[PDB]
Structure formats: C-alpha cells, structure tokens
Symmetry: D2
Subunit: 318 residues, 4 copies
C-alpha cells in the first residue's frame, strides 16, 4: 500500500531523484537502467542511508521492466546528456530511440502511472513518449519550466537580497534557448519585477541579463562540470511535480503539457502553467499575453514543432 515510484534511468538525475524520494518519504523506489549493477548499487547505498535520516522506503534496482509493475509515478531520465558545445536538439537521434523502448515498458507494466519525462530535448521527447506508450495525455508530462523558473528565482533572490521562498517566476515555452520568462508574472512577494525596476530595486539591464542567464542556464552548468549536465535542480523540480501528484497538492507549476486548444495550440507538448493533482494534469492556466510575449511564445512553439518534424523525419510510427 505505499506508493511506488519507478525511476527509468539511474544516472546523475536518476540517483538524485531516488535520494529525494526517500528523504521526502514519497514511497518505495525502483531504479531501472540498462547498465547492470548501477541501479542495484545506488538503490542499496540510499537504502543504507535511510536509518541515518529516519525514512522508511523500500529500494531496489533492476534492468528488467517487469520490476516497474504497478508504479504510481514513473520518472524518465534514460538516454544521454549533453557535452560542452552541444545543443539539446543534438540528442534526438539517440534519445528518440530510448523513448521508444521506455514507452513500450510503461505501456506493458505501468500503464496507470503518472509519467514525468526529463530526457532531452524535452518538449519533443515527452511528445514521443506519450505516443509510444499510449497513456492518456493528462498522465504524461515533461519536467522543464520548474527548473528554468527555479534558476530565474535563484538569480532574482541574489539580486534583490531576499529569501528564495518569497520569489516567483513564470517561464513558459520550450525548454530551449527560446523559452519565455515572463517578467510581468514573476514577483518578489507579489510585486511584479517590472514594478521593482520602477521602484529602483533593480534595473532593466540587470533584469534582461537575468532573463538571458536563465535561457542559457543549462549550458552554463554543462560548461562548468564538463563531464555532464545539471542534476540537483532538475531532480528537485521533478520531485515537486511528483509530490503534487502523490499528495494531491494541486501545485501550479510550468510543465511541458499536452495542449488541446489552450494557448491556441493543439496536439503538442509545450511548457505552460498547469495544476497537478491526483488526476494528473488537471487544468492549464492560460494567461493573456501582450504583443511581445505572444511573439516570443509563438517562436518558442515553432522550435518545438521544428523538433517534432525532425522526430517524424526519422521514425515510421510517429
């Protein structure tokens, strides 16, 4: 009767997800990977940490999909990350094929799961995984905007010298160079950033620099680490989406969600604000854009369509 969380991919993000699921006592955890030994190892290491922190959760590792049977939530990091110099879209060839296998494992063994996709390029990969798996669209989502928004919140907290708890950010669109941070709908304690520029708490130029740093955030971390990409903030972000589902919190979070008409878009995953509860993606919050925001969003969406055509370009079934 505890919730069961299956982690497909037991790498950098996958391990961090497992550790956090325990610390937050979200349920039992299964780590799945094709490299044998790795998920069993990480599973046992985290299990062995549990008595120090006092959390009760069962941990196991597997390389067979039957291990995921009946999972309440499935989080997918399987595939490859970027190296310095690469865009996320350079990962499609390898990663699309991974989503195909993963999707078949979910369809067969955890068809009632809430599935959170992280593998990049995210808006394309999650669209793919939903098709391959055949799960209902409200039960399949992509983690991106919560990460982007959390980066922006960090930079803003630093700039204004305030608690991260009292900063809000709204970032929509692709998880891409062209994602759209909405300065008008980002706040300190409810006061929009555009108002804070007026009050002199910051400048326009500093605000623009933070928007740009947000757009380039993933790359900034790749360039520092060199051997891989970010994993702490991606993991935290997906975990918040998972907790909202498992605890029916109805968090409002920017996630790559399937649109049927919202924002005038039909049939794609795109980053938008969504309510997440026990029924999955329960509602999309459709804001009214001004002309500049609308332009940036249309462009972001065009990139996503570009990527989706590239996925079809290379795979029969899609």
């Amino acid at each position: 009767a505890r919730s069961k969380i299956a982690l497909i991919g037991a790498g950098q993000i996958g391990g961090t997800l497992a550790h956090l699921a325990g610390l937050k006592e979200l349920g039992d955890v299964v780590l799945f990977d094709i490299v044998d030994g790795v998920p069993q190892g990480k599973a046992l290491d985290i299990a062995e940490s549990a008595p120090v922190d006092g959390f009760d959760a069962k941990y196991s590792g597997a390389s067979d999909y039957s291990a995921i049977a009946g999972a309440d939530v499935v989080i997918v990091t399987a595939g490859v990350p970027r190296k310095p110099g690469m865009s996320r879209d350079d990962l499609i060839g390898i990663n699309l094929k991974v989503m195909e296998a993963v999707g078949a494992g979910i369809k067969e063994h955890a068809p009632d799961a809430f599935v959170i996709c992280i593998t990049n390029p995210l808006d394309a990969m999650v669209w793919a995984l939903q098709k391959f798996s055949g799960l209902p669209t409200n039960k399949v989502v992509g983690m991106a905007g919560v990460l982007d928004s959390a980066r922006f919140r960090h930079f803003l907290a630093e700039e204004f010298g305030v608690s991260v708890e009292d900063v809000t950010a709204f970032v929509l669109g692709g998880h891409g160079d062209d994602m759209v941070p909405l300065t008008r709908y980002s706040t300190v304690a409810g006061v929009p950033l555009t108002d804070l520029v007026k009050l002199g708490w910051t400048t326009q130029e500093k605000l623009d620099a933070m928007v740009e740093r947000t757009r380039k955030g993933g790359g900034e971390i790749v360039n520092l680490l060199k051997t891989g990409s970010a994993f702490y903030a991606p993991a935290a972000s997906a975990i918040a989406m998972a907790e909202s589902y498992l605890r029916d919190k109805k968090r409002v979070l920017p996630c790559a969600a399937y649109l049927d008409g919202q924002y005038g878009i039909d049939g794609l995953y795109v980053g938008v604000p969504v309510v997440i509860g026990e029924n999955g993606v329960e509602r999309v919050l459709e804001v009214t854009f001004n002309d500049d925001e609308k332009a940036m969003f249309e462009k972001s969406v065009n990139s996503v369509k570009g990527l989706i055509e590239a996925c079809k370009s290379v795979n029969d079934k899609l």
Copy 2:
C-alpha cells in the same frame, strides 16, 4: 551556543509558539508568565514530546524576568484576548499596562533581543513596547500582516482549488477592520488576482467577499471558539518571522514595522512589507499605490494614530 527564544506569555499562542519552535529546531525555549505553574507545565509537556519527533531543545518555565537573560528572540503574547462582541481596541486599558511591565523586563534582561509583539491591539501595543523597552526600532516588530495574509491565502487557495504554496497575498495597514489587502499584489503563481478575475478563474464579487472575510477573520474565529481567539495561525506567523531572523533568511513579510519616512509616515508602527534577517527589520518595500489603495491605506493609518493618541491619553511616559 544554541539560540535562546523567550516567550513572554504562556497562554494559547505562547504554548503553540513553544511547540513550533521545537519542531522547527529553532533553539532553547523559555516560557514566562505571571500565572505560576502554567509555563513550567507547558514547558515540561513539550520537552516530554521531544523524543517522539527527534528535536533537541531545552525547555523551561518561569515567572521571573531574569529567566529571559540573553534571549536572541523574544515573542510577546502577554495580556488578554478578546471575547465575542469586543473589538481589539477594547483591550488597550489592560494590555498597555502589560506592555509597560514587559518592556521593563526586556530592557533589563534581554536588551539585544529581536522582539516580536503579538499582543493586541497590535499596531499600538508594539509602538508602546518599543518605547517602554527602549530597544532599537529595527529590533522590535509586530506580527499581524503575515496572519492576515495567510487567511487571505487560505480563502484564495480554496476558491481556485490550488496549493497554498502557490498563492501570495499582500495585506498592509493596521491589524484592524480597515487593514488593506492589495488584490493587485496578491497572486496565484505570479498572476495577479485582478488578472484572474479577467480570465474567469473567479469573479469580482467572490474576490470582494474574500477581502471582507479577511478583514473580519479574527472575529470569525472568536465567534466560533467563544472562550478565546485564534492561536494556531498567529503562532505559525510569528514563528516564520522568528525563523527569518535566526536563520538570516531575508523573508519579505508584511509586519507592523517602525517607519521613518517610508510610505510618507514617520514615528509609527504600521503593517508594511519588510525584509527580516540577522539585523532585524533590514528594509521596507515601499510600493506605489493607485488612488483607491492610497485612500484605504491613509484611513488604516489614521486608525492607528487614533489608537496611539488613546495610549498617550491614558499614560504619562508615552
């Protein structure tokens, strides 16, 4: 070397403060009261709960002010609460005299404390306590707006069917019938309430009703309980202010703060958004009002001045 928190008043709020200080592992706790036995009892009861939850904190009870020596934070609930039918301003006669004694105990034994006043009527009582005690104005604050704002957040979370974590409220002014909730600076995930009315997520009339329910919130709880007033949400609210100080979080919180020129006011405590860190009230966020907000705020402040004149009206020293 652990932080020491002194709780002046060991009643309904006082006990709840103590319990929360332990659960959040904020430090050692001293409960102070004039009714002997009560603070010792509550102290020992909470101490005895600690092994169940795993928090290490020393707890003691006293009716001598020397017990508070060297406290890092002092939270004052001493005095009397309302009964059904009373306004908060009916409490001045009794409560002003309490602040006089409390202020003298702080001045003598915990002069370097960060002091959070809760005793009502709050904007008057905290102004009094700061004068009686002589502590620097940035080290003395009133808990009110965080409570008011949290009520509004609850009502809003209910209305929109979203997580309390993703709702923001901005309530300024007196802790009074005329406090000012700013619908324009209250949000769901960064989207102002005024925009949500437009989007049809709620109505103007429902929004107005929630503003009113917020203004009358304290009374609503008095009328239900009958034997006393609210204590869980007041306690939680003060504890968040205390934690921001002790952990240097720089939370942005609406609190009754001493103004020297901000909002065009000099020499009063009034509810405004303030940054709280290791140096106390570190900054006041002065927003730009429209004409209606400015009118409501001027009125709220006039009530506060009314009450302050009533305190002088009845006490030589002030």
Copy 3:
C-alpha cells in the same frame, strides 16, 4: 484520494493532533465534538496557518458523525480529563458512556478505520471502545506507552546530557501508577541503563527516581497546569502511531493492544510493544521477563482487570 483522519474530541489534545497532522502532511482532517463552534473554529484556525508552513490539507469541524465517513484513521480524545487530586480511574463513569456513543459513531460511519484511543483511563476505555464499536481488535489500539516512554526518554536525556534521538525506553503495562519501565530494555545508543549504572554514567538511585517520575508523570503535569492535563506529548505520541499506519512504517511502539495469548493474557488491552503498519497492529513483541519484571507486569495487569470489572459493574452490554 488523500488519507482522511477523524479526530473525535476537539479539545486540548484534539486540536494539537490536528495541527500536527497538517504539519506532517498526513492527510485531510475532520475535527468532531459535541460543543458546537469549537471544532469548526480550531479547524479554520489551523487551515489558516497552513499557507505559512506550506502544507496542503483540508480541515473541517462537525458535531455530526456522518462527517467522519470513510476515515482512514480515527483518534479519540472525547470525554473528560483529570483535575489535581484525581486518579485516571475516577474518570470511568463519565468516560465509559462517552466511549459508548463514540463506538456507535465509528461502527456506523468509519468501520474500516484504524482507531487510536487516548481517553482515560486508557486500558479500560480502549477495551470498551473496541466492544462498542465492534471493529477488529487489530484495528483498535490505545495510546499510552509511547507517552510514558517519551517522558522516561526526556528524563534520561537530561540525566546523561545526550540527544533524545539516541535514547530508548521500554515501558509496558497499564497507563497507570503501576506501569512497568524496563530499565534493562531502555538504552543510550544501544547500551542498557543497567550497564550505564555500572559504567558510572549515572547511579541506581537516580535511575530509580527517573522510573518513579515516569510513573507519576501525568500527575506532575496536572499539578502544574491545574486547569487540565498534558496535551503536547500525548498528541505527538498518538501522531507517531498514526503515521506508522498511514505510511506503513512498521514502527515498534509500546501501545495498549488486544492480547490473544501473548504475555499469557487473553481478552484484554494491555501496554506491550507492537509493530504498527498498514494492517494495524501487525505483531506483538513478547519479551522474556526476569522475576521482578514479571511480578510488576502481573500487578499492572491486575489493575487493568480491576478496571475492566468496574466497567462491567456499571454497564449491561459489556
């Protein structure tokens, strides 16, 4: 789909239970009482605190038993507490009649609940409540030994100057003057207290005094407070039992449990170590006593039988 916790009695312990259930995010809460207004008030006050701490839980108050429908856990504090000068057994007359009504409300509206009884005198009241309600015996338990054990742990932590996290206590029998703390099965970091006396970390006489202080602990708190009895540690204790059920933790806790043969006893509730998980009381840990421990336990059990005969003495159905 969140768990639902019904709190029967919305007094001192009842309110504290509600507050803790939220803070630990255990589920939705219903407070039930016969004094109208009180459970609605406390419910709304805690609901209003929630945005400060970030927990999502629905709170309501009621005086009709239909409100408890479908509760996963029910915690019963309804009845009356002691005043200075009284034993717990002086509460039977009033409290037995309360258990009768409560039992009928559970039988009708939450027959699949895990029920934790707190109302005193506890070993008698829980035996009663199980009969009146007709629920399976593994789904009905009494909170006592966790409280007694936590008091002992506090006193021990103080004595040895160590963390409460690293102290263990084993207290069996009645929740009464004659409860049995087992010094041999109480420890600091795994080292029995009897060994610590030998090592000189404490003395026999200090150890005996702490055993006695534990036996008299409830009274010590009554005498301090004067208007009522302990509520923080009782509430924490029951909450740990509830969490073990709801999260299937399989905590090993001393609770008043129904015995069918364990410890050579059949047909009574007595304080023993039990494993609590998703199926209720899952196992009883039956330790081997030495002659002194066996004598103390037989006596404790005789008191419990005394009290049960007194309950039959005054009620047809039992």
Copy 4:
C-alpha cells in the same frame, strides 16, 4: 552570521554533502576542489535547486583555500576512492599526500573549524590530517562507524520487518574488514539482537551473515557501481555528525576519535561511541567488553596501528 560549512572535495560524496547541508538548512556552503569548474558547477546547480525546496543558503565553488576562511565545519573527501579489487589501504600513497595539503589549508584558513574526515583509509587519514593541520584532537574526527552502523541497521530492519527508526547498531573499531559490530549492544526498540535470536525473531546464522555483510558493505557497493564507491550513506552519516555539532545535539555516534587512554589506547584515532556537541568530541562512551569483543577490538586496533606505521614509513613529518 549563518554557519559556514566548507567541503574539501567536490566529488561524489562532496556534492551529496552539499545538497544535504542545504536541504537540512545547516548553513552556507563552500565546495573546494583542484579540478576547476566542478565545484562551481555543483554549487550553482544546488543553489538553483533551492527555490524548489525553500532553503536559503549561499553556495560557492573554489580551488583556492582562502575560500574556506572562517568555516565552522569542514568536511574532507579529497583524494581518491577504490575500484573493484582494491582494499581501502591501497589508497594510502595518494591519499596521505592529499591530507598533507588539506591539513595545511585548514591550519592556515579555518583553524577553529570542526573537521570531519571521510577520505580513506579513514582511521589512518584522520590521524594524519590532525597532525598536519595541528587542530585540537577534539575538533578533528573521522566519519566511519555511523556508516557501518547504518548498513547494519538497514540489514536488520529488513530482517525483522520493522522501521529503521526503531533499530540501533553499535559498530566499533577500524573502518575495515575487521570493524567490530556488537550484537549485544545493537537492538530493536531496546531489545538486544542476542535476545531476539532467543525469542526466535531471527537466527544466529542470519545474525552472523548480517555482521559479515556489514564488514564487507563498502566492497559490495564498489562491486555494483564499478566506477566508484558509496556516496549517499557516507554523506548522510557525516551530515548527522555535522548537525550534532552545529545544533549542539549531543548525539552519541560511533566515530573515529582521538583516544587518550580510553579503551586502554593512547594516541590513535579509532572508531568508538562519542558525544558530539558545540565543543566537538565532548565524551567517549567506554563500554565493558566480554572476551570475544575484546579480542575483535584488539585486532581491529592492531590493523589501525599497522596502517599508521605504513604512513610514517612513507612520510618524514609523521
């Protein structure tokens, strides 16, 4: 005024330490490493995660020791880990030289720190680091026994089907093949394992197998992962030691501590139960052994002396 934690080594354990220090809100964090980019990257990634979980902590990365200035706690993982086939003692050549540099950085820039050493082989490395650094012996400790004990607790929790919170383990000696788990001082809820065998809750043979699995635990994880050694449980373990210091918890934990006469040993670090508070290692709990335990402990200590002679064998200063 927040506590400052310096992490010397920003690898697998180092990163995990940083993440946990934030989640537990222990203070500001500096990650230090010789590979440039790595500590800056991990620091920024964790900083960027913070708004998701609500913790306020400053994070930075450095490859200059001046960055550690004034740290309250320093945790050292710098050096190299094992690959499959190696013992921990095969790491001395490289790691001793690392401790020399680290020790000089601490001596110069954080001489008032509480220093927790993790780098293997641990009992030798921490003895070295204390000499190189010259800090007082009560301010320098090795993390090992908490890890070993937590592995044993996991295996035991599994075996008995009980919560990890209610299992205790006592493991002394070297962090080595010959560490000494004390079955007599390990417990479920206060009942020794030797008593549980008698009660039939487990068998002698299963107990012996779990003792052995504990002794080989590090290797078991190396063999699974292949590219490195355990990091989640080592990190959790050190963090508990750090928290006990920073919050003056007085946890009783088995750690590699400097002995002056305890256990009849003078001048070495060996794994023993110690009280950790604001003054560092405050007390050693010296238990009385039976003849078998004494034999195992003397042997464990002889290995440690072996390793210390090997360190002198290869370095002038020691």
